[PDB]
Amino acid sequence: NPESADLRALAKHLYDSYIKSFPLTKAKARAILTGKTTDKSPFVIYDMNSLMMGEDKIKKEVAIRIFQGCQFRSVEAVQEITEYAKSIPGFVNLDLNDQVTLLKYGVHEIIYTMLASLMNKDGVLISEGQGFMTREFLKSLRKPFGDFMEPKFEFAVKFNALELDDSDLAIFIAVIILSGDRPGLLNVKPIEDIQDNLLQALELQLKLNHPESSQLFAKLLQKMTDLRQIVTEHVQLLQVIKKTETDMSLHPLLQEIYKDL
């Protein structure tokens, strides 16, 4: 029980850092998506003309502008994830090269994890929740942009079925970052010791927060397999773009992450 007390304190710490690092929480996202309120209602984009009026309501080629907007949020997300990673007990103490490595392979798995919070079966929240882009509008985009988002939705609806809240995700995200199996890690053992502590925290957290959810801990860990696959599909799709879209500029920070990924 004194051991469990330390785990709860770790859970509270991570959740607190989670709230402070990420602007759009899942709680706020679900409040917008369910449309229960009258002040948090998003403008919905489902075709070209709806997108046009969206430019005035929400603060080159259509498919390109959508992609460049996603690159912006992605880079901004890397900053937020990085800020959160620093708050993880023992992360900044690790070898400097391993810190870069853990973030390199970790950011996208987390991005797609938190992207699911902004997603349902019909679409995804955009621009801090001000807008809502339908799943069909994205799927109808010009090739190969019309299938860049579909694999994310498929994972989202299955991941959201686990019904995790932000207190759960906070620890799960930390578990992803501190992976000892990341390629190029100099000192793996100190990373595994931290993840071991994070896994204990996540286990107790899910058991207390979801007592009637049998093997939720196991089910959650298995979802990390789905994350890797989506990240893998994403990189391959990007290599197709850079050859067909030679005039489209990719962000240097992202390219450094994609480099030998």
| Site residues for a copy of itself per CB under 8 A | 158, 179, 181, 196, 199-200, 203, 214-215, 217-219, 221-222, 224-226, 228-229, 232
CB count in 10 Å sphere of residue 258:
17
Beta strand 123-126 with 43-45 is unpaired
User: Does 166 interact with ligand JJB (rule: CB under 6 A)?
Assistant: no
CB of 102 to ligand JJB, least distance (A): 16
**Residue 46 in marked binding region:** no
CB of 131 to a copy of itself, least distance (A): 30
Query: What is the distance between the alpha carbons of residues 118 and 108, in angstroms, rounded to a whole number?
Result: 15
Q: How far is CA 188 from the centre of its chain?
A: 24
By a kind-dependent CB cut-off of 5 to 8 A, residue 184 interacts, out of a copy of itself, ligand JJB, none, with: none
Q: Are residues 132 and 124 in contact, defined by beta-carbon separation less than 8 angstroms?
A: yes
Candidates 85, 111, 206, 220; binder of ligand JJB (CB under 6 A) is 111
Candidates 50, 82, 87, 127; binder of ligand JJB (CB under 6 A) is 127
Query: What is the distance between the alpha carbons of residues 127 and 118, in angstroms, rounded to a whole number?
Result: 11
Q: Which of residues 57-76 bind ligand JJB (CB under 6 A)?
A: 65-66, 69-70, 73-74, 76
**Residue 137 in marked binding region:** no
- Residue 88 is given by DSSP the state S
The H or E element spanning position 43 is: strand 43-45
- Residues annotated in the binding site, as ranges? 71-74, 108, 234, 258
